Amino acid sequence: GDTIFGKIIRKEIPAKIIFEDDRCLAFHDISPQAPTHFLVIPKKHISQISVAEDDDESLLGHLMIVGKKCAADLGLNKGYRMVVNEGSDGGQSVYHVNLHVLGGRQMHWPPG
Amino acid sequence: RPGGDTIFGKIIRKEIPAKIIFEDDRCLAFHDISPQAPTHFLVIPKKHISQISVAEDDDESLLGHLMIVGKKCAADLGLNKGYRMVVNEGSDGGQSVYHVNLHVLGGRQMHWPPG
Protein backbone atom coordinates (compact mmCIF):
# COMPACT_ATOMS: atom_id res chain seq x y z
CA GLY A 1 0.00 0.00 0.00
CA ASP A 2 0.98 3.61 -0.72
CA THR A 3 2.25 5.77 2.13
CA ILE A 4 2.91 9.41 2.87
CA PHE A 5 6.57 8.80 1.94
CA GLY A 6 5.41 7.70 -1.52
CA LYS A 7 3.61 11.03 -1.84
CA ILE A 8 6.76 12.85 -0.77
CA ILE A 9 8.83 11.02 -3.42
CA ARG A 10 6.23 11.88 -6.07
CA LYS A 11 6.35 15.55 -4.93
CA GLU A 12 2.62 15.45 -4.24
CA ILE A 13 3.16 16.91 -0.78
CA PRO A 14 5.97 19.15 0.37
CA ALA A 15 9.03 18.21 2.38
CA LYS A 16 12.30 20.03 3.05
CA ILE A 17 14.53 18.03 0.73
CA ILE A 18 18.23 17.71 1.56
CA PHE A 19 19.42 15.42 -1.20
CA GLU A 20 18.00 13.41 -4.08
CA ASP A 21 19.30 11.03 -6.69
CA ASP A 22 17.77 8.42 -8.98
CA ARG A 23 17.26 5.88 -6.20
CA CYS A 24 16.77 7.70 -2.89
CA LEU A 25 15.63 10.87 -1.19
CA ALA A 26 16.75 12.62 1.99
CA PHE A 27 14.51 15.10 3.77
CA HIS A 28 13.99 16.67 7.18
CA ASP A 29 11.61 14.83 9.50
CA ILE A 30 8.32 16.64 10.10
CA SER A 31 8.45 15.75 13.81
CA PRO A 32 12.14 16.22 14.71
CA GLN A 33 13.53 14.57 17.86
CA ALA A 34 16.89 16.31 17.72
CA PRO A 35 18.12 19.70 16.44
CA THR A 36 18.96 17.85 13.22
CA HIS A 37 16.68 14.94 12.34
CA PHE A 38 16.26 13.75 8.77
CA LEU A 39 15.25 10.61 6.88
CA VAL A 40 16.82 8.82 3.94
CA ILE A 41 14.42 6.60 1.98
CA PRO A 42 14.71 4.45 -1.14
CA LYS A 43 12.51 5.33 -4.09
CA LYS A 44 11.82 1.60 -4.42
CA HIS A 45 8.91 0.75 -2.14
CA ILE A 46 10.30 -1.68 0.38
CA SER A 47 7.71 -1.70 3.16
CA GLN A 48 10.05 -2.74 5.97
CA ILE A 49 13.59 -3.96 6.46
CA SER A 50 12.33 -7.46 7.31
CA VAL A 51 11.17 -7.98 3.71
CA ALA A 52 14.26 -6.53 2.00
CA GLU A 53 15.86 -8.94 -0.49
CA ASP A 54 19.54 -9.81 -0.87
CA ASP A 55 19.55 -7.87 -4.15
CA ASP A 56 18.66 -4.78 -2.08
CA GLU A 57 22.02 -4.83 -0.28
CA SER A 58 23.69 -2.12 -2.34
CA LEU A 59 20.62 0.10 -2.12
CA LEU A 60 20.42 -0.18 1.68
CA GLY A 61 24.11 0.64 1.96
CA HIS A 62 23.54 3.60 -0.35
CA LEU A 63 21.01 5.00 2.16
CA MET A 64 23.69 4.88 4.85
CA ILE A 65 26.36 6.48 2.68
CA VAL A 66 23.95 9.23 1.60
CA GLY A 67 22.99 9.53 5.28
CA LYS A 68 26.54 10.10 6.47
CA LYS A 69 27.33 12.51 3.62
CA CYS A 70 24.22 14.57 4.38
CA ALA A 71 25.13 14.55 8.08
CA ALA A 72 28.55 16.03 7.27
CA ASP A 73 26.95 18.61 4.96
CA LEU A 74 24.54 19.62 7.73
CA GLY A 75 27.52 20.16 10.05
CA LEU A 76 27.14 17.20 12.42
CA ASN A 77 30.84 17.01 13.20
CA LYS A 78 30.35 15.85 16.81
CA GLY A 79 28.50 12.75 15.63
CA TYR A 80 24.98 11.38 15.23
CA ARG A 81 22.79 8.30 15.45
CA MET A 82 21.28 6.29 12.60
CA VAL A 83 18.10 4.32 13.22
CA VAL A 84 15.94 1.86 11.29
CA ASN A 85 12.66 0.77 12.92
CA GLU A 86 10.94 -2.52 12.17
CA GLY A 87 7.36 -3.39 13.08
CA SER A 88 5.35 -2.71 16.22
CA ASP A 89 8.09 -3.34 18.77
CA GLY A 90 10.52 -1.30 16.70
CA GLY A 91 8.12 1.62 16.70
CA GLN A 92 8.01 1.82 12.89
CA SER A 93 5.67 4.70 12.02
CA VAL A 94 5.55 4.45 8.20
CA TYR A 95 5.69 1.20 6.25
CA HIS A 96 8.27 2.43 3.78
CA VAL A 97 11.89 1.67 4.72
CA ASN A 98 13.43 4.80 6.19
CA LEU A 99 16.79 5.55 7.78
CA HIS A 100 16.64 8.17 10.56
CA VAL A 101 19.67 10.35 11.19
CA LEU A 102 19.67 12.35 14.43
CA GLY A 103 22.25 14.77 15.79
CA GLY A 104 23.01 18.20 17.17
CA ARG A 105 22.58 16.96 20.74
CA GLN A 106 23.91 14.18 22.90
CA MET A 107 22.08 10.96 22.04
CA HIS A 108 21.37 8.76 25.04
CA TRP A 109 21.37 5.08 25.99
CA PRO A 110 19.32 2.91 25.73
CA PRO A 111 18.22 4.07 22.25
CA GLY A 112 14.54 3.95 23.15
CA ARG B 1 46.32 -7.92 12.22
CA PRO B 2 43.15 -8.29 10.10
CA GLY B 3 40.19 -6.64 11.80
CA GLY B 4 42.23 -4.18 13.89
CA ASP B 5 42.97 -4.34 17.62
CA THR B 6 39.73 -2.89 18.97
CA ILE B 7 37.77 -5.37 21.06
CA PHE B 8 35.82 -6.23 17.90
CA GLY B 9 39.01 -7.06 16.01
CA LYS B 10 39.93 -9.43 18.84
CA ILE B 11 36.49 -11.03 18.67
CA ILE B 12 36.73 -11.45 14.87
CA ARG B 13 40.03 -13.33 15.29
CA LYS B 14 38.67 -15.47 18.17
CA GLU B 15 41.19 -13.97 20.61
CA ILE B 16 38.40 -12.83 22.91
CA PRO B 17 35.27 -14.96 23.34
CA ALA B 18 31.83 -13.88 22.20
CA LYS B 19 28.42 -15.48 21.74
CA ILE B 20 28.27 -15.67 17.97
CA ILE B 21 24.99 -15.83 16.06
CA PHE B 22 26.18 -15.80 12.48
CA GLU B 23 29.45 -15.53 10.60
CA ASP B 24 30.41 -15.18 6.95
CA ASP B 25 33.35 -13.82 5.00
CA ARG B 26 32.17 -10.20 5.30
CA CYS B 27 30.70 -9.95 8.77
CA LEU B 28 30.01 -11.29 12.22
CA ALA B 29 26.87 -11.14 14.37
CA PHE B 30 27.18 -11.67 18.14
CA HIS B 31 25.31 -10.77 21.33
CA ASP B 32 26.01 -7.51 23.16
CA ILE B 33 27.67 -7.94 26.58
CA SER B 34 25.54 -5.11 28.03
CA PRO B 35 22.10 -5.72 26.49
CA GLN B 36 19.56 -2.88 26.51
CA ALA B 37 16.68 -5.10 25.45
CA PRO B 38 15.73 -8.75 25.95
CA THR B 39 17.52 -9.44 22.64
CA HIS B 40 20.44 -7.15 21.77
CA PHE B 41 23.11 -8.11 19.28
CA LEU B 42 25.74 -6.51 17.05
CA VAL B 43 26.60 -6.98 13.40
CA ILE B 44 30.09 -5.88 12.42
CA PRO B 45 32.15 -5.99 9.24
CA LYS B 46 35.28 -8.12 9.28
CA LYS B 47 36.94 -5.29 7.34
CA HIS B 48 37.99 -2.65 9.84
CA ILE B 49 36.15 0.65 9.33
CA SER B 50 36.48 2.92 12.33
CA GLN B 51 33.13 4.73 12.07
CA ILE B 52 30.38 5.33 9.55
CA SER B 53 31.53 8.91 8.91
CA VAL B 54 34.71 7.61 7.22
CA ALA B 55 33.13 4.76 5.23
CA GLU B 56 34.12 4.81 1.56
CA ASP B 57 31.70 4.83 -1.38
CA ASP B 58 32.67 1.25 -2.27
CA ASP B 59 31.69 0.15 1.24
CA GLU B 60 28.00 0.42 0.19
CA SER B 61 27.33 -3.27 -0.41
CA LEU B 62 29.12 -4.22 2.82
CA LEU B 63 27.08 -1.77 4.89
CA GLY B 64 23.89 -3.04 3.28
CA HIS B 65 25.03 -6.58 4.00
CA LEU B 66 25.21 -5.72 7.71
CA MET B 67 21.53 -4.75 7.61
CA ILE B 68 20.47 -7.83 5.64
CA VAL B 69 22.33 -10.07 8.04
CA GLY B 70 20.82 -8.13 10.93
CA LYS B 71 17.25 -8.67 9.76
CA LYS B 72 17.90 -12.34 8.96
CA CYS B 73 19.38 -12.93 12.42
CA ALA B 74 16.44 -11.12 14.04
CA ALA B 75 14.06 -13.47 12.27
CA ASP B 76 16.15 -16.49 13.30
CA LEU B 77 16.04 -15.27 16.91
CA GLY B 78 12.26 -15.04 16.83
CA LEU B 79 11.88 -11.26 16.92
CA ASN B 80 8.53 -11.51 15.14
CA LYS B 81 7.03 -8.38 16.77
CA GLY B 82 9.81 -6.19 15.41
CA TYR B 83 13.10 -4.59 16.41
CA ARG B 84 15.28 -1.50 16.10
CA MET B 85 18.59 -1.14 14.27
CA VAL B 86 21.02 1.52 15.47
CA VAL B 87 24.38 2.90 14.39
CA ASN B 88 26.19 5.26 16.76
CA GLU B 89 28.64 7.73 15.26
CA GLY B 90 31.16 9.66 17.31
CA SER B 91 30.70 11.50 20.58
CA ASP B 92 27.10 12.64 20.16
CA GLY B 93 26.13 9.15 18.98
CA GLY B 94 27.78 7.68 22.05
CA GLN B 95 30.18 5.52 20.05
CA SER B 96 32.58 3.69 22.40
CA VAL B 97 34.24 1.16 20.07
CA TYR B 98 35.70 2.58 16.88
CA HIS B 99 34.88 -0.33 14.64
CA VAL B 100 31.60 0.13 12.73
CA ASN B 101 28.77 -1.82 14.35
CA LEU B 102 25.05 -2.23 13.81
CA HIS B 103 22.95 -2.73 16.96
CA VAL B 104 19.80 -4.84 16.71
CA LEU B 105 17.45 -4.61 19.70
CA GLY B 106 14.14 -6.36 20.23
CA GLY B 107 11.93 -8.39 22.54
CA ARG B 108 10.28 -5.37 24.14
CA GLN B 109 8.49 -2.23 22.98
CA MET B 110 11.09 0.30 21.85
CA HIS B 111 10.32 3.94 22.65
CA TRP B 112 10.57 7.26 20.82
CA PRO B 113 12.84 9.23 20.62
CA PRO B 114 15.59 6.62 20.14
CA GLY B 115 17.76 8.17 22.84
Ligand SMILES: CNC(=O)[C@H](Cc1c[nH]c2ccccc12)NP(=O)(O)OC[C@H]1O[C@@H](n2cnc3c(=O)[nH]c(N)nc32)[C@H](O)[C@@H]1O
Ligand atom coordinates in the same frame (compact mmCIF):
# COMPACT_ATOMS: atom_id res chain seq x y z
C1 LIG C 1 29.95 3.01 26.53
N1 LIG C 1 29.24 3.22 25.28
C2 LIG C 1 28.54 2.23 24.72
O1 LIG C 1 28.60 1.08 25.12
C3 LIG C 1 27.65 2.61 23.58
C4 LIG C 1 26.26 2.80 24.15
C5 LIG C 1 26.20 3.83 25.25
C6 LIG C 1 26.51 3.70 26.61
N2 LIG C 1 26.31 4.87 27.27
C7 LIG C 1 25.86 5.84 26.43
C8 LIG C 1 25.49 7.17 26.56
C9 LIG C 1 25.05 7.87 25.44
C10 LIG C 1 24.95 7.27 24.18
C11 LIG C 1 25.31 5.94 23.98
C12 LIG C 1 25.76 5.23 25.09
N3 LIG C 1 27.54 1.58 22.56
P1 LIG C 1 28.57 1.52 21.15
O2 LIG C 1 29.96 1.92 21.62
O3 LIG C 1 27.96 2.21 19.94
O4 LIG C 1 28.57 -0.03 20.74
C13 LIG C 1 29.55 -0.92 21.26
C14 LIG C 1 28.83 -2.09 21.90
O5 LIG C 1 29.81 -3.11 22.08
C15 LIG C 1 29.50 -3.80 23.27
N4 LIG C 1 30.74 -4.41 23.75
C16 LIG C 1 31.85 -3.79 24.20
N5 LIG C 1 32.79 -4.70 24.54
C17 LIG C 1 32.28 -5.92 24.30
C18 LIG C 1 32.73 -7.31 24.43
O6 LIG C 1 33.97 -7.56 24.93
N6 LIG C 1 31.89 -8.30 24.06
C19 LIG C 1 30.65 -8.05 23.56
N7 LIG C 1 29.86 -9.09 23.21
N8 LIG C 1 30.17 -6.79 23.42
C20 LIG C 1 30.93 -5.72 23.76
C21 LIG C 1 28.99 -2.74 24.23
O7 LIG C 1 28.14 -3.29 25.25
C22 LIG C 1 28.29 -1.76 23.29
O8 LIG C 1 26.85 -1.89 23.34
Ligand SMILES: [Cl-]
Ligand atom coordinates in the same frame (compact mmCIF):
# COMPACT_ATOMS: atom_id res chain seq x y z
CL1 LIG D 1 9.90 4.53 11.23
